[PDB]
């Protein structure tokens, strides 16, 4: 197993950015990757999981910003779709943990109905610095009161 990537369940983690020689490593214990900075920042082309037949979701969020609630609802479906079809999905933005942390920590709200309290230590305990920003806590909140 990839060591840099710590799960939340059976299905999904959370990471910093693999490396270009990480890739294979990677794509050998996931199917899908969710790819949470923009092309900008990448060292290689998402082009490189493609070929290695990777399902890929780009959606950029901006350094130390919080995605919107419609933006992490898309990407919490995307993620239940490919758990649904059995593959496991990596989260990753760069070395930070705030983007890749606010998705990990909803991803156990949306698929487990954890409460954000509980979600939050959770992932907190694998990677203390997931959810930097009052921004990103504040879009949690948001997203549990949608989901009651």
């Known amino acids: 197993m990839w060591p840099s990537a710590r799960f939340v369940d ?3 983690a959370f990471s910093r950015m693999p490396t270009e020689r990480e ?3 990677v794509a050998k214990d996931f199917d899908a990757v969710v790819v949470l900075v923009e092309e900008y920042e990448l060292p290689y082309s998402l082009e490189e999981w493609k070929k290695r037949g990777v399902e890929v979701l780009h959606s950029p969020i901006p350094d130390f910003t919080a995605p919107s609630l419609e933006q992490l609802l898309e ?3 995307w993620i239940e779709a490919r758990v649904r079809e059995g593959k496991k999905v990596l989260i990753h933005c760069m070395g930070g943990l705030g983007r890749s942390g606010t998705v990990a920590v909803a991803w156990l709200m949306y698929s487990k109905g954890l409460p954000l309290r509980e979600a939050l230590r959770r992932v907190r305990s694998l990677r203390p610095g ?9 879009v949690l909140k948001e997203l549990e009161k949608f989901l009651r």
Request: net charge negative; no cysteine; hydrophobic share 40%.
């Open 75 to 77: 990407i919490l479906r």
């Open 130 to 138: 997931a959810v930097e920003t009052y921004e990103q806590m504040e």
């Open 23 to 25: 890739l294979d490593e």
């Open 10 to 12: 059976d299905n999904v």
